[PDB]
């Protein structure tokens, strides 16, 4: 009788698990702050690591990696990126990042207006991203003026990424769209990609001569399902699943998500994990890590994959809940508390 | 040459010190009934070793140590086991009932009519050095004497010697070999009080060094003879700067100087390997990079934390055996660029290494089996925290409903100097996460 | 050299606490004549914890016995061990408490007591280092309850911070002498719950249940439900008699299982309890999983009602001690529900190597349970079912007594009850 | 890589690696707080001992 507790009652998805864990009969919940537990579904901030794995006779699982912050901050993700050899700062599937401190607080203020500055030279298009983590907050321009003025204005950190000028238009429609994967890392550190993605699409036709409605510009499920006068009126729920996605990319280009983006797909999420294993991996720790986590994409119109952002609490499409949730139960609490396919992975095998 | 006085308190404190004074003899040469046929100065003389040793006209090697607890069971030991004829009376101090678990008890009720003696006792260890470094006072957080009365006894040291440095090795508490529910209160009201008395404090979670001796040993239930000689290997190389040849850590102001930038972060983390089975048929003898790579695993710690996720202020690596500074560096330079290696900003990023070339001995028929290389390495990390944070805890767990506490009151103490104790490890935790945390 | 100091009171106590003493002199290798036989030294390691040592080798038990007519205590010494026994520690009337607390408390008893604490006084005088006294006694007659009752109450005004320690035999109707033993166990009960450091709680029905259905024994004597006791009590000593890390002296154990000073009432527990299939061999998780069970229990009182303060097993016999680690984290981890989550780690451990007579293993269980509750609630519920009439309290407002201190006691132990009530939230 | 202070003797070496460069009570109040337990402890004994006269 395998025990665990629950300390992030917002989860969609461990919610989903904790139902399935007790269908077992196997698995029994204690209150949250009971420390005779199996499994922690733990808290997303301050989670107390510390007070894991000292508990005798009990050997401890807990979903969530310390230190995979590093990886689904804005700027955490960006100074990785540009310091870690293995991605060193020519990495080709990044956007141009740069990290701008606002001035009332290191800081690439002037290491961004360099590059700005020989793109307004060159004729070359420059049209910037503002954002950061304490957004819903985002601003569109092609003017540094505005850019900085805008961070200024906050108090938090921030980061100024190239703006994809040219992505990838959906038809009919011409309208933008981002890609969700759902990466799932269990305790030995496999890492399994869900088959099964999403493109959280954009009802509103791409405008590149506007920046100032970002109902067009942003996919959010939120934003346009608020702001965008198209919700839900080529798809539903602005949700398009691989399989009418993959249809489309026969159709109209003549290839296959397979070969056009899942291999780029494939290939970025196992240099970002594969980056940071050292300082996460919970190989010989007194307790064990497993993590799910949602990573957005963009594709330009010549078929290649940016990487955007790694959610470290993602949710799920309404539609992928049972699938994957079950998923998770199978390949990474299971694993460990066995009970008494044809995966719905797909295992990015790597070098450990 | 400068002398170190040794004390011991409770029955962690006193057995641990057994373990280590079996193993200061071994290395050293001195036999159970005190000769030592290397010495060839009879009766005196200024060598590494007699910082722990002072001599007779009989030629007799006497600790320079004290063992005191308050119940004269465990101490009774002492004077009938195998190095009986290394001590005399005076340096062996027993009450006839003991704290029961009550730090109130050992610090107030029984050790206020106690105190008096120890200090007496260490004061005639006192007068046969000629230039007095410190103490090094062994003690547990759990047991009512190793907590309470070793509290107490610091305040005095501190009155009595006041330009001395003082260090500590302190047991943490851990369930898997305690049957005692009160010791996180214990651990919490001695630290307090000791904190600003204690300059440097190699703290030991006996939850390590139990899984350390069933994973590396293959003892499916340790005795605490098993987990002292471990222990004792430990202690024998953190204090072996010492006691020989040598020109890092050479005395304890040296500890402080090379550990503790801050005074309050004084809790160097403590690593050692290997840990070899002597039942084992035969072990392939690891190499020096292999040995060093493991200080950074966290199955070898002396507490179970994560450095990763921490920073360093300090660090030594202690190597005993076949080792050259040609192998130290190569090691070092392939750690760097595997491991996550964060030091503060206002520290170097470095190591001050030290080497002695006799490798570690082996108490004969004990568990561990001879290496001819053996590293430990000393890092003040603020990973370190964690053992704080589970600790006061389960301090809060109890004290929100003052369990267990009316048994404190009644020896004297005032419910006062909990929260007190507790804030000041909530300040603890605080200048820990100010270092290491952005 | 940490000596303990025993005292039987009245009929229940000293045929107890005789038969108590017939179980640990066999176990140390004590004939009945006070000389040694055994075969092994830890049987000698902490002899003088209960025995005193005279010459020629002999072992004289530490022990006191008291009542206030002498038929049972004469059995005692024409009993099987009744030789052992000091002959100046008998100490007796001849009135007889009449199953009577203000006798036995107030007037028979109070005109012994100064000679009985005589006995104490020189017990304890030649104890190199005393732990603390442990009184066998029942609560539902007139001299274990009134009398022994007061024995504390003057012992511990003259030994203030020594432990005491009582075996408490709480009364039930279905296992009953007279009506007024609810009576009588309300009275002591606030005497132990102000002077007793720890009171293990023994109630006969308890007992009686366990001879009937578990033991199978068609008709159970007084004797048969001593047995239990004996055993019982040899268990919960065991820390004490023998070379422990764990629990090993009285004030160390008061110290762990104590939270709240007057919540120190115990539930014990044995096991094994087999009927004679009686030489199949137990295993240990058997030993554990009867171990927890209320069945197993002696307090008759059902633990899933309550909840755990503290929890501390011993463990007799040789066996894996890896495979009691196992087990005893696999109860806790399997029942983690009905332990309070506010006291890490209250649920302790300990083994010994030498088991009981006739056992290869046992294990014997003492539980702080708030679930106690339940045992005070029956005797104030009978309690107040005469005292409402007034009847029967002729035979104390006769002794001097008055019916506000029956109305103290009442108000003294609801208040007990709302106490092991809060905490159980 | 830098190696500075190194020392050598019979029984071994020491020197140092650097990496990177960086960027009480008296006597007279511990007596008082001994006599002041001392002393809680002798009035809850007379509450006890007063309770037992009554
Ligand atoms: N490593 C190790 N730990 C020990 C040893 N003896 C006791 N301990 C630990 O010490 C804690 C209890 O403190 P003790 O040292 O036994 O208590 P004490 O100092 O004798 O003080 P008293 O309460 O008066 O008995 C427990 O957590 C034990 O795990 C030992 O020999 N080695
Ligand atoms: N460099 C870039 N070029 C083009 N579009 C970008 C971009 N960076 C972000 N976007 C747009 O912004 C959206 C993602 O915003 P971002 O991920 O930074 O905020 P967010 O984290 O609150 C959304 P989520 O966490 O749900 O993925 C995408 O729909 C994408 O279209
Ligand atoms: N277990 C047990 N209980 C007893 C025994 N004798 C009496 N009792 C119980 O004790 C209560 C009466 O107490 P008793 O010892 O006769 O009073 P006293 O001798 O005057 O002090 C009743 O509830 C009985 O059930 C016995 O030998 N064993
Ligand atoms: C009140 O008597 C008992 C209470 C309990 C038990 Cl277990 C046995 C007896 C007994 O043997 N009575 C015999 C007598 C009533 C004739
Ligand atoms: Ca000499
Ligand atoms: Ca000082
Ligand atoms: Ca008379
Ligand atoms: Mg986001
Ligand atoms: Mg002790
Ligand atoms: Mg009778």
Redesign the interface.
């Known amino acids: 009788?395998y025990?665990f507790v629950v300390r992030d009652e917002n989860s969609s998805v461990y919610a989903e698990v904790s139902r399935l864990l007790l269908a077992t009969g196997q698995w029994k919940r204690?209150?949250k702050?009971?420390?005779?537990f199996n499994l922690m579904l733990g808290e997303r901030n301050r989670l107390?690591?510390?007070?894991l794995?000292?508990e005798?006779?009990?050997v401890q699982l807990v979903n969530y990696y310390?230190?995979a912050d590093k990886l689904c901050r804005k700027a955490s993700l960006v100074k990785l990126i540009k310091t870690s050899p293995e991605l060193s700062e020519s990495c080709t599937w990044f956007p141009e990042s740069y990290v701008i401190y606002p001035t009332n607080l290191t800081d690439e203020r002037e290491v961004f207006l360099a590059a700005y500055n020989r793109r307004r030279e060159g004729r070359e298009g420059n049209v910037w991203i503002a954002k950061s983590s304490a957004g819903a907050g985002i601003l569109i321009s092609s003017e540094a003026s505005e850019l900085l003025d805008f961070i200024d204005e906050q108090g938090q950190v921030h980061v100024i990424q190239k703006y994809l000028e040219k992505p990838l238009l959906l038809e009919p429609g011409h309208r933008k769209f981002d890609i969700r994967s759902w990466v799932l890392v269990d305790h030995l550190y496999n890492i399994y990609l869900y088959r099964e993605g999403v493109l959280r699409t954009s009802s509103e036709p791409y405008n590149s001569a506007n920046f100032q409605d970002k109902t067009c510009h942003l996919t959010n499920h939120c934003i346009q399902k608020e702001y965008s006068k198209n919700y839900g009126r080529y798809e539903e729920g602005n949700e398009m699943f691989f399989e009418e996605f993959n249809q489309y990319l026969m159709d109209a280009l003549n290839t296959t998500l397979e070969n056009s983006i899942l291999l780029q797909i494939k290939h970025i999420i196992r240099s970002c994990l594969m980056c940071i294993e050292?300082?996460i991996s919970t190989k010989?720790?007194?307790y064990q890590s497993f993590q799910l986590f949602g990573f957005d994409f963009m594709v330009d119109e010549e078929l290649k994959v940016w990487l955007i952002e790694v959610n470290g609490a993602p949710a799920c499409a309404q539609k992928l809940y049972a699938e994957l949730c079950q998923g998770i139960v199978d390949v990474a609490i299971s694993s460990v508390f066995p009970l008494a396919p044809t995966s719905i992975f797909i295992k990015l095998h790597h070098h450990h | 040459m400068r002398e170190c006085i040794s004390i011991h308190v409770g029955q962690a404190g006193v057995q641990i010190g057994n373990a280590c004074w079996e193993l200061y003899c071994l290395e050293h040469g001195i036999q159970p009934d005190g000769q030592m046929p290397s010495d060839k100065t009879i009766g005196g003389g200024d060598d590494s070793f007699n910082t722990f040793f002072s001599e007779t006209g009989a030629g007799k090697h006497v600790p320079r140590a004290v063992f005191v607890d308050l119940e004269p069971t465990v101490i009774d030991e002492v004077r009938t086991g195998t190095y009986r004829q290394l001590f005399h009376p005076e340096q062996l101090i027993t009450g006839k009932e003991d704290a029961a678990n009550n730090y109130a008890r050992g610090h107030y009720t029984i050790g206020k009519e106690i105190i008096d003696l120890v200090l007496d006792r260490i004061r005639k260890l006192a007068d046969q050095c000629t230039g007095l470094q410190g103490f090094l006072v062994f003690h547990s957080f759990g047991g009512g004497t190793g907590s309470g009365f070793t509290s107490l006894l610091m305040e005095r040291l501190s009155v009595d010697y006041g330009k001395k440095s003082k260090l500590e090795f302190s047991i943490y508490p851990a369930p898997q070999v305690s049957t005692a529910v009160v010791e996180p209160y214990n651990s919490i009201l001695t630290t307090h009080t000791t904190l600003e008395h204690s300059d440097c404090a190699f703290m030991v979670d006996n939850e390590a060094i139990y899984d350390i001796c069933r994973r590396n040993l293959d003892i499916e239930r340790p005795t605490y003879t098993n987990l002292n000689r471990l222990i004792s290997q430990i202690v024998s190389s953190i204090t072996a700067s010492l006691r020989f040849d040598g020109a890092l850590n050479v005395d304890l102001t040296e500890f402080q100087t090379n550990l503790v930038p801050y005074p309050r972060i004084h809790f160097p983390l403590a690593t050692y390997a290997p840990v070899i089975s002597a039942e084992k048929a035969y072990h392939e003898q690891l190499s020096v990079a292999e040995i060093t790579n493991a200080c950074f695993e966290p199955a070898n710690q002396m507490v179970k934390c994560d450095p990763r996720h921490g920073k360093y202020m300090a660090c030594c690596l202690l190597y005993r055996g076949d080792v050259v500074p040609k192998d130290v560096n190569a090691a070092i330079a392939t750690i760097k660029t595997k491991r996550s290696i964060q030091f503060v900003d206002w520290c170097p990023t470095g190591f001050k290494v030290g080497i002695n070339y006799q490798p570690p001995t082996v108490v004969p028929g004990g568990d561990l089996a001879k290496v001819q290389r053996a590293v430990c390495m000393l890092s003040n990390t603020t990973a370190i925290a964690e053992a704080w944070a589970r600790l006061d805890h389960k301090f809060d767990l109890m004290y929100a409903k003052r369990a267990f506490v009316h048994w404190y009151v009644g020896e004297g103490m005032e419910e006062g100097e909990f929260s007190e104790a507790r804030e000041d490890m909530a300040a603890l935790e605080k200048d820990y996460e100010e270092v290491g945390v952005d | 050299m940490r000596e303990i100091v025993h005292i039987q009171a009245g009929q229940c106590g000293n045929q107890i606490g005789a038969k108590f003493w017939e179980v640990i002199s066999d176990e140390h290798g004590i004939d009945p004549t006070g000389s040694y036989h055994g075969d092994s030294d830890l049987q000698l390691e902490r002899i003088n914890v209960y025995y005193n040592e005279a010459t020629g080798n002999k072992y004289v038990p530490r022990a006191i016995l008291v009542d206030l007519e002498p038929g049972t205590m004469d059995s005692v010494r024409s009993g099987p061990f009744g030789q052992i026994f000091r002959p100046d520690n008998f100490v007796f009337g001849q009135s007889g408490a009449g199953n009577n607390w203000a006798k036995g408390h107030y007037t028979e008893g109070a005109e012994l007591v100064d000679s009985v604490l005589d006995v104490v006084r020189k017990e304890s005088e030649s104890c190199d280092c005393l732990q603390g006294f442990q009184l066998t006694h029942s609560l539902g007659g007139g001299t274990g309850s009134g009398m022994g009752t007061l024995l504390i109450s003057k012992i511990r005004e003259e030994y203030p911070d020594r432990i005491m320690n009582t075996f408490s035999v709480m009364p039930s109707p279905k296992v009953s002498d007279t009506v007024v033993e609810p009576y009588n166990a309300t009275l002591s009960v606030h005497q132990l719950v102000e002077n007793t450091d720890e009171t293990y709680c023994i109630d006969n029905e308890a007992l009686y249940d366990i001879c009937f259905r578990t033991l199978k024994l068609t008709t159970p004597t007084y004797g048969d439900l001593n047995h239990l006791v004996s055993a019982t009590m040899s268990g919960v000593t065991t820390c004490l008699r023998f070379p422990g890390q764990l629990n090993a002296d009285l004030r160390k154990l008061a110290v762990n299982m104590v939270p709240f000073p007057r919540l120190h009432f115990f539930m014990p527990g044995f096991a094994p309890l087999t009927s004679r299939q009686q030489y199949r061999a137990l295993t240990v998780p058997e030993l554990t999983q009867q171990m927890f069970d209320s069945k197993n229990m002696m307090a008759a009182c059902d633990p899933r009602h309550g909840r755990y303060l503290t929890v501390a097993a011993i463990f007799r016999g040789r066996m894996s001690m890896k495979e009691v680690d196992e087990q005893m984290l696999n109860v806790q981890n399997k029942n983690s529900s009905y332990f309070v989550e506010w006291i890490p780690n209250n649920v302790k451990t300990a083994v010994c190597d030498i088991p009981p007579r006739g056992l290869k293993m046992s294990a014997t269980f003492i539980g702080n349970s708030t679930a106690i509750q339940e045992l005070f609630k029956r005797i104030s519920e009978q309690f107040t079912a005469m005292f409402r009439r007034k009847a029967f309290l002729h035979w104390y407002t006769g002794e001097g007594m008055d019916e506000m201190e029956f109305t103290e006691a009442e108000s003294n132990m609801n208040d007990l009850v709302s106490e092991y009530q809060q905490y159980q939230d | 890589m830098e190696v500075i202070e190194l020392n050598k003797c019979t029984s071994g070496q020491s020197f140092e690696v650097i990496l990177k460069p960086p960027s009480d009570p008296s006597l007279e109040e511990i007596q008082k707080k001994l006599e002041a337990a001392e002393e809680r402890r002798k009035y809850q004994e007379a509450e006890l001992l007063k309770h037992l006269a009554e």
């Open positions: 009788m025990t204690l209150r702050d009971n420390p005779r107390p690591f510390g007070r794995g000292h005798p006779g009990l310390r230190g050292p300082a010989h720790l007194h």
